[PDB]
Structure formats: structure tokens, C-alpha cells
Scaffold this motif. Structure first.
Motif, short mmCIF file in Angstrom:
data_model
loop_
_atom_site.label_atom_id
_atom_site.label_comp_id
_atom_site.label_asym_id
_atom_site.label_seq_id
_atom_site.Cartn_x
_atom_site.Cartn_y
_atom_site.Cartn_z
N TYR A 148 39.46 31.45 50.97
CA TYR A 148 40.73 32.11 51.19
C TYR A 148 40.70 33.12 52.33
N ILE A 151 45.51 38.94 52.65
CA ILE A 151 46.34 39.84 53.44
C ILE A 151 46.74 41.06 52.63
N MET A 303 45.76 40.32 48.74
CA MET A 303 46.15 39.16 48.01
C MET A 303 45.78 37.91 48.82
N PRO A 304 45.39 36.80 48.15
CA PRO A 304 45.28 35.55 48.85
C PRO A 304 46.54 35.21 49.64
N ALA A 307 44.71 29.36 52.01
CA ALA A 307 43.60 28.70 51.32
C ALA A 307 43.12 27.48 52.10
N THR B 22 54.19 42.10 50.95
CA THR B 22 53.74 41.50 52.17
C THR B 22 53.97 39.96 52.15
N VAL B 23 53.86 39.37 50.98
CA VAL B 23 54.03 37.95 50.84
C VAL B 23 55.30 37.56 50.08
N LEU B 127 50.19 31.27 44.40
CA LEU B 127 48.79 31.25 44.85
C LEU B 127 48.41 32.64 45.30
N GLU B 128 49.36 33.39 45.84
CA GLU B 128 49.01 34.76 46.25
C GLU B 128 48.74 35.63 45.06
N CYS B 129 49.19 35.17 43.89
CA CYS B 129 48.89 35.78 42.60
C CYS B 129 47.81 35.06 41.82
N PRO B 131 44.75 35.71 41.25
CA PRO B 131 43.99 36.47 40.28
C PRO B 131 44.64 36.68 38.91
#
Ligand SMILES: CC(=O)SCCNC(=O)CCNC(=O)[C@H](O)C(C)(C)COP(=O)(O)OP(=O)(O)OC[C@H]1O[C@@H](n2cnc3c(N)ncnc32)[C@H](O)[C@@H]1OP(=O)(O)O
Ligand SMILES: CC(=O)SCCNC(=O)CCNC(=O)[C@H](O)C(C)(C)COP(=O)(O)OP(=O)(O)OC[C@H]1O[C@@H](n2cnc3c(N)ncnc32)[C@H](O)[C@@H]1OP(=O)(O)O
Ligand SMILES: CC(C)(COP(=O)(O)OP(=O)(O)OC[C@H]1O[C@@H](n2cnc3c(N)ncnc32)[C@H](O)[C@@H]1OP(=O)(O)O)[C@@H](O)C(=O)NCCC(=O)NCCS
Ligand SMILES: N[C@@H]1[C@@H](O)[C@H](O[C@@H]2O[C@H](CO)[C@@H](O)[C@H](O)[C@H]2N)[C@@H](CO)O[C@@H]1O
Ligand SMILES: N[C@@H]1[C@@H](O)[C@H](O[C@@H]2O[C@H](CO)[C@@H](O)[C@H](O)[C@H]2N)[C@@H](CO)O[C@@H]1O
Lengths: 316, 316
Positions: A148, A151, A303-304, A307, B22-23, B127-129, B131
């Protein structure tokens, strides 16, 4: 239609942008930096409709040392492959990769990797290119694990300084730190990161781009940080067109193995981020991380973002 | 730390933005639109430190009809849950989700979905979440397939007109098409999409936002399209702050089952994109798509942009 070696980096950059530029915006400065400085056996093969470039593959064999490590000639890399959207499903990708793979195999390659090369553009197959995974599967690449890019906007949040034992101190690199840095990398990171420090310092990386952590007088870890004054465009800032003004980035980061798991990486990351914050950085990237390390950065609100899937073909 | 019900939308949006903005850049217009208009039994539980909001969960039970479908009270939804980054790993998320799930379970819910609600923000766990998947897994949610938002810049590519076909026409909807569209939806898409057409027209969707494909006189398909003049902010343009000035979007899109696999979807898509292109749209999103249909949009240079994991908990 003809397959042949190609030299016109501008045509390649345009085809790249037209096809994937929304999510991987390329510029000529980046393209030239990464293609030209790469030290591996490397080639770009193009597909052409008369004079017109309609596809390309960039590919490499591991033939140059990595710090103290000899090259492993059994490894080759598909840096990138793009066929123009108006010419898909005509077998051009197949032709391009047949050519590249055949050349690589004939020079001794047995393991073919999607991305992950030196001066790479991608750690693996981007999620945005997920449909290509099937293209690679048909050819015998196996889909593995993910990496990943993360950001975050370092202007939006503040953290308490983590606690650490006495005797450690973090500061931006000074010119007199160079010898200590190299001695440390030879000891602790003597492959790729050593090689990159050697090479990157020759094409514009500056001491201000490196943060060092010391135990008394000894270098025990580092980070590479990026902002809009960096001359060298490293992976965290490849896609800076997506990051706005006052972009930045952080990676790699490393702590001597004997010093790990005592909170020193957290301290180095904290101080590196403070440096960037005081440089007025806002959105910034952490590049090419593994799932099990996301939370280390997560606690600092990263955060990712992107990917990439690792993918490998074993030559029969 | 108190857990209580809240309707402080500004505070929620501010905490949303600080943490994930940010996302997933949120604006209050969108947040209010989606929350105020939703017709399900719905609630927001806040976590508070004194008067300061430090976390929230938004949750819903399927209590309102979906077109021709009566409600299924056994289904509940976690719309969103966010705990502020400076207050993580202190038990707040657990308390919030416990409060949501207990209420829903007490009202007859047996199946709990992450996202995918009416007036959703997310089709699943972003996907940004990634975790948060660990947090949900421990709490009994099963991780299932992915869905995708796709992105493309329609200004960048010219497409050939698809094979011209007798009887079929594609045009932006006119007010006199209303009855024909509704009858079509009642026949072919009589659940969620029927429901949304009915509801969205009451909160500012206009005919210029709808494209229809007719065989002779009969509606056989539709798309919902978006640009920077749309007053109804639907999923394709949720995240418009990432899409630049002349943003747009497309979704949903559908062809009557009887007419599928003959190129009419393609034609409807092509003409819908042509309308947007003529409206000067550049970057645009196609929302909440399944893996096996990505290539259908991919032909028009769309790429996966955001991924969401479907996730479901079965109450024991
Ligand atoms: C390391 C990296 O470079 S990762 C990035 C990969 N590059 C990209 O994703 C860029 C955007 N996409 C492209 O440029 C193209 O789609 C490529 C390069 C992936 C494929 O190029 P094409 O010239 O269309 O491939 P070609 O016609 O040889 O396809 C051969 C076969 O591979 C498979 N394949 C190709 N594209 C797809 C797809 N989108 N989905 C599923 N299978 C596919 C099919 O089996 C296809 O045979 P078919 O056409 O009978 O279905
Ligand atoms: C449908 C959707 O909403 S998808 C999006 C989900 N949201 C996000 O991803 C937003 C970003 N993330 C977050 O907001 C948070 O990380 C959340 C909401 C996922 C979790 O909230 P938190 O308040 O950190 O959760 P909480 O503290 O209750 O639990 C996290 C862990 O800390 C543990 N914990 C609880 N108290 C303590 C403590 N005092 N010390 C250390 N650990 C603790 C919990 O046991 C839990 O561990 P477990 O999962 O192994 O049981
Ligand atoms: C090959 O075709 P192509 O990739 O379309 O490249 P073009 O023929 O447009 O030429 C692009 C550049 O590469 C150069 N070039 C052509 N063949 C070359 C070769 N074998 N080695 C190095 N450079 C080459 C051309 O001279 C041109 O350079 P210039 O504009 O600096 O003179
Ligand atoms: N050999 C792999 C490393 O290269 C990976 O680390 C990443 O390396 C790149 C290239 O040096 C850096 O720019 C990144 O910051 C860094 N994370 C590693 C990723 O887990 O996987 C291998 O060790
Ligand atoms: N029931 C799910 C549908 O809702 C999904 O389709 C998506 O629906 C949303 C909301 O109606 C639209 O905004 C999207 O355009 C549309 N693609 C569907 C996705 O495969 O999954 C279910 O059928």
C-alpha cells in the motif's frame, strides 16, 4: 503494425497519461529521472501503427549490484505495460510481453516480477489496473499479497511526543553526518536502501531530505522526507499532481535491528512528521508499505490510499 | 465520556473531515441531504467528552418500503462510524457500535450490514478503512466481496459510435417521459431503483439528469448522469472535491433483462458519456460496481478508483 524498440519518452508519457493519467499522472521530468538513472539492463519496446506509438512495455533484468548484494540475474521485471485504449483486445499486449519475456528468459531470467524494480513506478499491479490481473494470470503470473501507499494531511492533526529512554536525539541530517549514515546503512540496510542512498545523492537528493536518529553520537536510524523543494522525485511524491499544494512524503524509514521495538521508530516518525509540518506540508504519502505495518502510520492519521498486488511468473 | 444521541451535523462533518477527509471529503450540504431525506428508522449516537463530540455512529433499520418491496425489519445498517484519532483504542468505538447493535437487535434486526443503506455514504467498508476490518471481524462481521467506484476522464478519449441499430434511440429524458420511466422501473427495476427515482425527484433531481434508451416508443433502459449543475448530489459525485472543476458521474444504469447481451447497454453508455462530454465534464465516477462488470466500463477508459468490502454480521 510493428513491435520495435522506442526512444521517444514524450510519446510514452502521453500514452501513459491518456490511458491511466487520472490515477497515475506522469510527467516527463519523473519519467526521465527514473528511466535514465536506472542501472539495470533495461529496454522499452513499443508497438506502432505506422509512426504512431500504440503500446509499450518497459522491462529490466537484475544486473547491477544492490549495495553489498550481487545482482541476481534470475530476476526480471515488468516496470510497466500499457496498450492504448483504442487498440485493446487485438493481441498487442501479448506481443509486447512475449517479446520482453523472451529476451529476458534468453538472458537467464527465471522469475518475472510485476513492478518492484529499481526506479519503479509501481510496487506491484495497481488496484486501478485490477483488470490486468487476468491478463497476467493467463500468462502464468501468480497473484500474491498486497502493498500500500498511505496518505494523510499532516496539517490537520497534532500528536503528543512519544516517550523514549534517555540518550536518543533526532535531527535533520548535516553534511558531517554522511560518513556515519553510510556506515550505518552498510551495517543495517546494506542492500536496496544503501544502493539508493549512494545513487540518489548523485542525482539531487540533499541532506535536508534525510532525518537521522542517534544514540549519543551513533546513527541508529533514518527517514527520507519529501516536500515541494525536493529536487529528487522519490516514490512518495511520484503522484504529487494528486496531492495539491504543499505536498510531501515519507519513505523509506529504518531503525537498526538491535534497536527495534522500543518505540524509537515511533519517535523518528513523529519528529520527521513535525519537521514536515513545520515546512508547511499538508497532504503527504507513505509509500510501499505492508498490511502489518499500516497501523504504525495509522496512529498518526495515515490511511491506505493505493494498493498494489505482488505478482510473479516462474519460468517453466 | 458520555454516549448520547446527537443531531449536531456540523460537528459530525468536522470530525469526519479531520479524520478521513483526505480521501472522503464531506460537505455539510451532502451530509444534510442524505441524512434528512432518508426514510428509514435512523439515528445518530455520539460519544462526548463534556460537550465535545469525539466519535459517532449512524445506523438504520429497513422500515420503509423499497419500490414494490415491503420493508424487511430483519436488516439493519451501520451507515458510518468514526472515532476521533486522538481518542482511539479507549473503548469508544466498541461502546458506540454496542449501542447501535443493541438497539437494532432489540427492534428485530438479525442481519447487520456495513454500509449499503439508503442514502449511504459507502457501499461497504472502504479500502482506505482497511484497518477497521479487524475491528468489525472481532465483532462478528464477515468480510465478503468487493465493490468499486470507477473513475475516468471523458475529455481525454474519442470513442467510435457503436454499430447503428434500427428502432433504438437514446436521449435525455423530457418531462413527458415520466410516466414511461416509472412504468419501466415498475417492470424491470422495482426495488431500490424505483424507490430512488420516486424519492430523488422530490428533492431536486431533474429530467436533464436522466438518459433513456427506447425501442421505438418503449423505454427499455436508463442512466442517471451528473455534472456540476446537478442539484441532487448522488453517489457518483459524493467525492466531487477530488474530481476537479468540471466533475461528473454516471450511475445507476440499467437495461431491461430481456434486452441484455446485445450491445444496447454499450449504446446507452456511449450516448450517456457523449452527453456528459458535450456538457464539458472531465473527471467522473461510476459508482458501486461489481468486479465482473468493470470491463464493460473499462472499454470507455474507466478504472477502479475506490474499493469497498461488503460486510455482514448475523445475529446469533
Ligand atoms: C506491471 C504493470 O504494468 S501493471 C499495469 C498493467 N497495465 C494496465 O493495466 C494498463 C491498462 N491496460 C492495458 O494497457 C491493457 O488492458 C493490457 C496491457 C493489460 C492488455 O493489453 P491488450 O493488448 O488488450 O491485451 P491482449 O489483447 O494481448 O489480451 C490477451 C488476453 O489477456 C486477457 N486480458 C486482457 N485484458 C483483459 C481484461 N481487461 N480483463 C480480463 N482479461 C484480459 C484476455 O485473456 C485476452 O484475450 P481476449 O482479448 O481473447 O479476451
Ligand atoms: C461502515 C463503516 O463505517 S466503514 C468505516 C469505519 N470507520 C473508519 O475506518 C474510521 C477510522 N477508524 C475509526 O474511527 C476507529 O478506528 C474505529 C471506529 C474503527 C474503532 O474505534 P475505537 O474507538 O478505536 O475502538 P475501540 O477502542 O472500542 O476498540 C479498538 C481496540 O482497542 C481495544 N481497547 C479498548 N479499550 C482499550 C484501552 N483502554 N487501551 C487499549 N486498547 C483498548 C479494544 O478492545 C479493541 O481491540 P479488539 O478489536 O481486539 O477488541
Ligand atoms: C524509434 O522511433 P520512436 O521511438 O518514435 O522515436 P523517433 O524516431 O521519434 O525519435 C525520437 C528520438 O530518438 C532518437 N533515436 C532514434 N533511433 C535511436 C537509437 N537507435 N538510439 C538512440 N536514439 C535514437 C531520434 O534521433 C530522436 O532523437 P532526437 O529528436 O533527439 O534526434
Ligand atoms: N525490498 C522491499 C522494500 O523495497 C520495501 O520497502 C519499500 O522500499 C521502497 C524502495 O526502497 C521505499 O521507497 C519504501 O519507502 C519502502 N517501504 C518493503 C516494503 O515492506 O518490501 C521489501 O523489503
Ligand atoms: N442492491 C445493490 C444495488 O444497489 C447496486 O447497484 C448500485 O446501486 C446504487 C444505489 O442504487 C447506485 O447508485 C449504483 O449506480 C449502482 N451500481 C448493485 C451493484 O452491483 O448491487 C446491488 O444490486
Amino acid at each position: 503494425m510493428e513491435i520495435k524498440e522506442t526512444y521517444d519518452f514524450s510519446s510514452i508519457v502521453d500514452l501513459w497519461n491518456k490511458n491511466i493519467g487520472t490515477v497515475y499522472p506522469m510527467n516527463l521530468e519523473l519519467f526521465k529521472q527514473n528511466y535514465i538513472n536506472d542501472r539495470q539492463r533495461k529496454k522499452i519496446m513499443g508497438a506502432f501503427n505506422g509512426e504512431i506509438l500504440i503500446g509499450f512495455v518497459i522491462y529490466k533484468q537484475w544486473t547491477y549490484k544492490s549495495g553489498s548484494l550481487k545482482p541476481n540475474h534470475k530476476i526480471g521485471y515488468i516496470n510497466s505495460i500499457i496498450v492504448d485504449i483504442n487498440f485493446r483486445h487485438q493481441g498487442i499486449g501479448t506481443k509486447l510481453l512475449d517479446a520482453a519475456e523472451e529476451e529476458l528468459i534468453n538472458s537467464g531470467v527465471k522469475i518475472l516480477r510485476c513492478g518492484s524494480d529499481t526506479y519503479h513506478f509501481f510496487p506491484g499491479i495497481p488496484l486501478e489496473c485490477l483488470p490486468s490481473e487476468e491478463f497476467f494470470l493467463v500468462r502464468g503470473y501468480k497473484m500474491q499479497d498486497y502493498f500500500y501507499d498511505l496518505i494523510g494531511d499532516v496539517s490537520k492533526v497534532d500528536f503528543k511526543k512519544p516517550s523514549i529512554k534517555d540518550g536518543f536525539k533526532v535531527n535533520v541530517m548535516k553534511p558531517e553526518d554522511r560518513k556515519g549514515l553510510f556506515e550505518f546503512l552498510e551495517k543495517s540496510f546494506s542492500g536496496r536502501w544503501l544502493e539508493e542512498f549512494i545513487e540518489f545523492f548523485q542525482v539531487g537528493m540533499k541532506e535536508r531530505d534525510i532525518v537521522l536518529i542517534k544514540y549519543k553520537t551513533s546513527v541508529i536510524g533514518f527517514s527520507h522526507i519529501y516536500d515541494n523543494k525536493s529536487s529528487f522525485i522519490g516514490p512518495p511524491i511520484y503522484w504529487k499532481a494528486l496531492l495539491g499544494h504543499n505536498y510531501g512524503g515519507l519513505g523509506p524509514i529504518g531503525i537498526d535491528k538491535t534497536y527495534r521495538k522500543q518505540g524509537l521508530g515511533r519517535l523518528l516518525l513523529y519528529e520527521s512528521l513535525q519537521i514536515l509540518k513545520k515546512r508547511e506540508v499538508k497532504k503527504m504519502v507513505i509509500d510501499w508499505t505492508e498490511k502489518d505495518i499500516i497501523n504504525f502510520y495509522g496512529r498518526f492519521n495515515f490511511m491506505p490510499w493505493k494498493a498494489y498486488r505482488k505478482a510473479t511468473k516462474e519460468v517453466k
